[PDB]
């Protein structure tokens, strides 16, 4: 795993482990939008998944984390403009029970 430089934010704790959402978004002709999930192992951050590749979105999404039923939940919702705001919003939920693998379940708002 060789992830591209990104910023670390949205830190949370699960199963007594520190996790992180790494946002890669430098603008260029060789840089895509990568939304990473990393875990603090010893003294290094280990990238687990690239969450944005598992979506059909074209712009930066709105991200949300919440722990529920011993499970992690990361939401990727389409960013809608304030003037051009649609009556229906789309999100992409990513659950997990172990903290290693994730599944997808696209939802609507």
């Amino acid at each position, epitope marked *: 795993k060789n992830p591209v430089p990104c910023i670390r934010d949205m830190f949370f704790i699960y199963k007594n482990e520190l996790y992180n959402i790494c946002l890669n978004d430098l603008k260029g002709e060789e840089d*895509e939008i990568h939304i990473y999930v990393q875990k603090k192992v010893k003294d290094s951050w280990i990238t687990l998944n690239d969450l944005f*590749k598992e979506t*059909d979105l*074209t*712009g930066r999404p709105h991200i949300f984390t919440y722990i529920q039923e011993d499970e992690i939940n990361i939401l990727l919702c*389409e960013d809608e403009e304030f003037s*051009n705001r649609k009556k229906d919003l*789309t999100c992409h939920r990513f659950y997990s029970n172990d903290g290693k693998e994730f599944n997808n379940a696209e939802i609507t708002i």
Partner: antibody
Amino acid sequence: AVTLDESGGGLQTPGGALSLVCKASGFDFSSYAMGWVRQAPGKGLEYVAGIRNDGSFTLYTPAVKGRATISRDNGQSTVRLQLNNLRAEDTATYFCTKSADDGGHYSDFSGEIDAWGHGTEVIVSS
Amino acid sequence: ALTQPSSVSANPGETVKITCSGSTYNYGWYQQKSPGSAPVTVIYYNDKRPSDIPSRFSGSKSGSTGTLTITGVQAEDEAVYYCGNSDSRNVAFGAGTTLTVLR
């Protein structure tokens, strides 16, 4: 009465540049994404470039990297395409397409096409 | 990539089924009679049909496979049909499927 009126193609010198346009009518132009589709002689369909409903997101086929520029005028309902450094592989018939969504999803540009133009022919030849 | 069969043959009155695999998102179907001629949308957004397309055309999706359906195919339905979708964050089309009416 959705109409898509293309123009701007024809004989083009290799290594030169061209410009296509698409005068759309019959729908709220600002609410949907637009794009161009080409078809080379004896080949299938290929998506060339797409743009969002407002224009903040553009996509291109790998074969036009660094040579294409897609733009739109929501007040004029015109979407254009510009191709520089023309090669013989760009000789094709180009169709202007309208999407059913805004362009927030990749499958909007090729999976939700609800309107096509009548096409225009580009010939890159010396 | 978006995979669809090369050719499909059918007698008139039969139910034809052209499939397209490779994407879990929204499918479209576009009919082209002559090469270089303007294609016409028959099915878009998985199952929507334009108001000028005959009712025998229908669309479907299951998993990562879109399915176009022509119930009781007619002789005038001869054409090549292209499926469009997003193959791994890339706007793409299928290779095209030619419908040859049997005679």
